[PDB]
Amino acid sequence: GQKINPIGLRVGIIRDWEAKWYAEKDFASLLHEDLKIRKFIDNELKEASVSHVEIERAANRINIAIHTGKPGMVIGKGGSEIEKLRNKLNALTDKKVHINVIEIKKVDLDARLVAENIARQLENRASFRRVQKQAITRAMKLGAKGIKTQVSGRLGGADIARAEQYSEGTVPLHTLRADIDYAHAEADTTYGKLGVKVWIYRGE
Amino acid sequence: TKEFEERVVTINRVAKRRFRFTALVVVGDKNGRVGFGTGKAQEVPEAIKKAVEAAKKDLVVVPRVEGTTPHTITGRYGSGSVFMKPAAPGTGVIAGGPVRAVLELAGITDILSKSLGSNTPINMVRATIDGLQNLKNAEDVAKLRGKTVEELYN
Amino acid sequence: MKQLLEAGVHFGHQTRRWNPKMKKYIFTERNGIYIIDLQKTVKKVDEAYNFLKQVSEDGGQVLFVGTKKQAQESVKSEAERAGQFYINQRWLGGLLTNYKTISKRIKRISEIEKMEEDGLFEVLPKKEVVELKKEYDRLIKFLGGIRDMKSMPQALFVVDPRKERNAIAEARKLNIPIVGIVDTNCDPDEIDYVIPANDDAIRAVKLLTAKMADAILEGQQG
Amino acid sequence: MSSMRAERVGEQMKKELMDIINNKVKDPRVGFITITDVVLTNDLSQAKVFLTVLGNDKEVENTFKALDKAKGFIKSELGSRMRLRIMPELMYEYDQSIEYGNKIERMIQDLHKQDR
RNA sequence: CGACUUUCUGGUCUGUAACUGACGCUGAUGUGCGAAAGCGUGGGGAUCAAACAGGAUUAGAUACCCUGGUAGUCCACGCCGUAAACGAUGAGUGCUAAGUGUUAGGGGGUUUCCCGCCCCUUAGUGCUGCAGCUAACGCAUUAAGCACUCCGCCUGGGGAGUA
RNA sequence: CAUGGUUGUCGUCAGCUCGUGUCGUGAGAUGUUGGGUUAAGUCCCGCAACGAGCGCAACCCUUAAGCUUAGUUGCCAUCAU
């Protein structure tokens, strides 16, 4: 297509892969097992808005690291909920796991977090325009070299598929030394689907 | 620096279509200073802010006599003629929309006014501002000429 | 102050057009070239001298502009000696006062000169330096008013108002005093302190700038 | 890109153009007895004039450097003469077909030489 | 209103200024002049050319193009009295920055000498431009600026320059 | 022809814009026009109009010369086989 998710080209040059394990011809089993944990992630997504997870496969152990929106209750008061998450994952993937929760970068300047935020804000019957203004305001307040959020679909309870963009600063896409964070989200209340792609440009 | 009162005179989405909002805003302290500005943007509050900032840069100093003009005047700006004359206390600001806006926002409490000719709000406001800025106060008029006050006055 | 002989060293003015509202200030037209009266020029030079000394006494800040040829280096030397900033190239609209996003320009030059100190040449490939150095010198040249000002004009110096109509217009809009060399065909109304000197008289220009620098020096010392 | 109308405009413009260039362009010291031929676009905004000169490769250049100045006068008078609405811009170019056609006659010698 | 000569004749400009001493400005009604076309009586008629004739072109061409050609174009005396008759700017007067051409003069300076040049000035005729004016375009000492005098004219478009 | 997401075509066509002074009563202009120059809105000059962003390029990879590390299953200067 005209525009392709840039993090597809970015990976393998400056940034690591979403999922990582040892190389062998039995990649089908590893990928079909990883898909189960990826689909299971939604349970923690719906309450902690975890951006993404890097999963590692040791000699016989599995290491993951979630980027939660807040670590306080994902780690629990004193570890009241991590053990049951580990047990559920062990049951589902038919293999144990080594959960290492790390809080996402303190500033809410990342991509998937704000993407889910604005998706839920739209689903809660709030003006996408005002939400975008707040998002870009706090984005430039926090300090970012470039940030744009696109939306598409039937906005504002309409029947017309229109698209909007609200960017700021220098945002080099064709440039490769950009170190960006492409995200996506889906939102609706009663009307179809409304996709949003948030782009973050932090440092070169 | 200090508090100023603002109010909108006309908001129009005007086309060339890259049609966006243009704002006519008068800004005055209601204690002897007033000014107007125009601003164009994509959202109404931003246009209002731009108009207010533009107005604050050019502030008139209307001479004051007991909340009315020292003398009669007639502002003119390109077919924008407006005639205003002072009035006794309690008369009320008799004026049209833009003229009333600028007059009250300048601190004027009671005058008699009437616009003549063009009723386009931008020209009307520029006319009123011109008329207000070319008022002459009695004390500096006395100083401007060789004379002094207490021999000739209002 | 000013020497009458140095006034007599200055002579002549360009004769292609003249402001007829200055026509009283001509001493005696001769040789087809308008010449100025040095008698009142000395008085105006003295009043500008003491005014600038007073302004610099309280910490006044005055710019020096060098847009015209054959005087740029003189103005630059004058600015560095006087302790003020310079305009070594064309004067842009609001080039001095950091309202027309020239603060972004000066910040950009600062960061691209600091990152090289932190390491930018032969640590990152040539493919980036070939453009970054080109941009850096581009902004050095085009940003002829590269300055260390705090968006505070206060006052200004204009060498030729014909080429600095922009500078004098912005000065009038900002209500800051104007004083400098004014030739035979410049408007004296728009300039608060007018010094009727010539433009082709390069040595007279250098002497005048040295005089204003001495004024600023006396102001800053006491 | 051509219509009969353009052809008539070209012919009637040629007739007047030859007249003016040789009877009213005094000031250029290099006047030359010229022949002409003119073509135009279908919309009559562009016109090409083709002509011949007598002299060397510095006299054709002097005459051209004189025609370049005179173009204003030519356009003024031409518009003052013809009913046409929009004055086409005029550029003057040598009719190379004269020398090319002459070179075209040259190889005729070769055909007659080998067969004789 | 452009060939030349002669006769008769109107206006304007410059310098001096002793001469009359406000004799001035505007101007309804009135009376004259008034491009071209057109009308009447005659004369002339080379070129050109409404109408008209033919040919060409075109889906059609009564038109543009070509071949001819009458009235007319020309002259004398009358009539007609209109024009995008325009600077689309009424006449008179005074004041208000400049720069630069050009026509007819006048004066001063320099130069031995003006045939040169420079300066000053009056009256036309151009261009560029301040203040100022205009809705803008633009005008700007030849104002569309600042003022006074007098005359003519306008009050939405069409109907209508009609009845 | 309710759409998200994804993809074609113009088309690697060379364009698309915005802030800011500050021109204009205003709609608007401007920057982005003009000159040289490039396949390119690429560079320079002038430009009260200026300044800035997306886009182009570069950034990536392969390859085209070479130097260093490393020689196995590969290679054979010197060797035997």
- CATH code, B106: 3.30.230.10
Domains in chain C: how many in total?
Answer: 2
What are the CA-CA distances from residue A37 to residues A21, A56, A156, B154, C133 (Å)? 14, 12, 35, 91, 49
Q: Which residue, chain included where needed, has tokens 């007279």?
A: C204
Classify B128 as helix, strand or coil.
helix
Yes or no: say if B56 and B97 are a contact pair by the CB < 8 Å rule: no
Q: Does C165 lie in the same domain as C67? A: yes
Scored b (16 or more CB within 10 A) or e, D16-55 reads ebbebbeeebeebebebebebbbbbeeebeebebbbbbee
> Within 10 Å of residue B46's Cβ, how many Cβ atoms?
15
Scored b (16 or more CB within 10 A) or e, C204-215 reads bbbbbbebbbbb
The identity of residue B26, as a single letter, is V
Q: Does C188 lie in the same domain as C97? A: no
Q: How far apart are CA C3 and CA C9, in angstroms?
A: 10
- Six-digit token string for A146: 């470039």
Closest C-alpha to A20, from A66, A62, A68: A62
Yes or no: say if D20 and D77 are a contact pair by the CB < 8 Å rule: yes
At what angle are helices D4-23 and D59-81 packed, to 10 degrees?
A: 120
Q: D75: domain CATH number? A: 3.30.300.20
Residue C148 lies in a domain: no
Residue D107 lies in a domain: no
Give D100: exposed, middle or buried? Use CB within 10 Å, 0-12, 13-18, 19+.
exposed
Measured to protein CB atoms, the chain E nucleotides within 7 Å are 65, 97-99, 118-119, 134-136
Q: Does C176 lie in the same domain as C85? A: yes
Whether B79 CB is under 7 Å from strand E = yes
Whether C21 CB is under 7 Å from strand E = yes
Q: How far apart are CA D44 and CA D10, in angstroms?
A: 9
Q: How far apart are CA A84 and CA A94, in angstroms?
A: 15
Yes or no: say if B28 and B105 are a contact pair by the CB < 8 Å rule: yes
Residue D5 lies in a domain: no
Task: Considering all nucleic acid strands, name the nucleotide whose C1' atom is nearest to the C-alpha of residue C29.
Answer: E119
The identity of residue A87, as a single letter, is N
- Six-digit token string for A88: 């559920």
Residue D11 parent element (H or E): helix D4-23
The identity of residue C69, as a single letter, is K
The gap between B69 CA and E17 C1' (Å) is 61
Whether C20 CB is under 7 Å from strand E = yes
Q: Write out the residue range of the structural domain in which residue D45 sits.
A: 10-94
Q: Does C178 lie in the same domain as C190? A: yes
Closest C-alpha to C8, from C204, C213, C170: C204
Q: Does C167 lie in the same domain as C61? A: yes
Give A1: exposed, middle or buried? Use CB within 10 Å, 0-12, 13-18, 19+.
exposed
What are the CA-CA distances from residue B149 to residues B62, B66, B141, D55 (Å)? 20, 18, 9, 92
Residue D45 lies in a domain: yes
Measured to protein CB atoms, the chain F nucleotides within 7 Å are 2-11, 18-29, 43-60
Q: How far apart are CA A60 and CA D99, in angstroms?
A: 92
Q: How far apart are CA D19 and CA D78, in angstroms?
A: 11
Yes or no: say if A61 and A21 are a contact pair by the CB < 8 Å rule: no
Task: Considering all nucleic acid strands, name the nucleotide whose C1' atom is nearest to the C-alpha of residue C97.
Answer: F21
Q: Write out the residue range of the structural domain in which residue C82 sits.
A: 24-91+155-222
- Six-digit token string for A158: 């309409």
Q: Mark residues 128-157 of chain A whose C-beta is closer than 7 A to nucleic acid strand F.
A: 146, 150, 152-154
Q: Mark residues 170-199 of chain C whose C-beta is closer than 7 A to nucleic acid strand F.
A: 170, 173-174
CA angle B73, B77, B82 (to 5 degrees): 40
Closest C-alpha to B84, from B58, B48, B60, B108: B108
The identity of residue A182, as a single letter, is Y
Task: Considering all nucleic acid strands, name the nucleotide whose C1' atom is nearest to the C-alpha of residue B80.
Answer: F25
Last residue of a domain, one of C143, C178, C208: C143
Q: Write out the residue range of the structural domain in which residue B86 sits.
A: 73-144
| Resolution of the experimental structure, in angstroms | 2.9
The gap between B127 CA and F26 C1' (Å) is 15
Residue D105 lies in a domain: no
Q: How far apart are CA C167 and CA C67, in angstroms?
A: 11
Q: φ, ψ for residue D26 (rounded to 5)?
A: -80, -60
Q: Does C169 lie in the same domain as C65? A: yes
Last residue of a domain, one of C143, C167, C186: C143
Task: Considering all nucleic acid strands, name the nucleotide whose C1' atom is nearest to the C-alpha of residue C18.
Answer: E98
Whether C18 CB is under 7 Å from strand E = yes
Give A187: exposed, middle or buried? Use CB within 10 Å, 0-12, 13-18, 19+.
buried
Q: Does C160 lie in the same domain as C221? A: yes
Domains in chain D: how many in total?
Answer: 1
Q: Does C190 lie in the same domain as C202? A: yes
Give A112: exposed, middle or buried? Use CB within 10 Å, 0-12, 13-18, 19+.
buried
Q: What share of chain D is helix, strand, coil (3-state, %, to 5)?
A: 50, 15, 35
Q: φ, ψ for residue A135 (rounded to 5)?
A: -65, -45
Yes or no: say if C182 and C124 are a contact pair by the CB < 8 Å rule: no
A71: left (phi over 0), alpha (psi -120 to 50) or beta: alpha
CA contacts within 13 A on the Cβ side of A47: 6
Those residues with Cβ within 8 angstroms of residue C111's Cβ, 6 or more apart along the chain or in another chain:
none
The gap between A98 CA and E139 C1' (Å) is 90
Q: How far apart are CA C180 and CA B4, in angstroms?
A: 38
Yes or no: say if C160 and C67 are a contact pair by the CB < 8 Å rule: yes
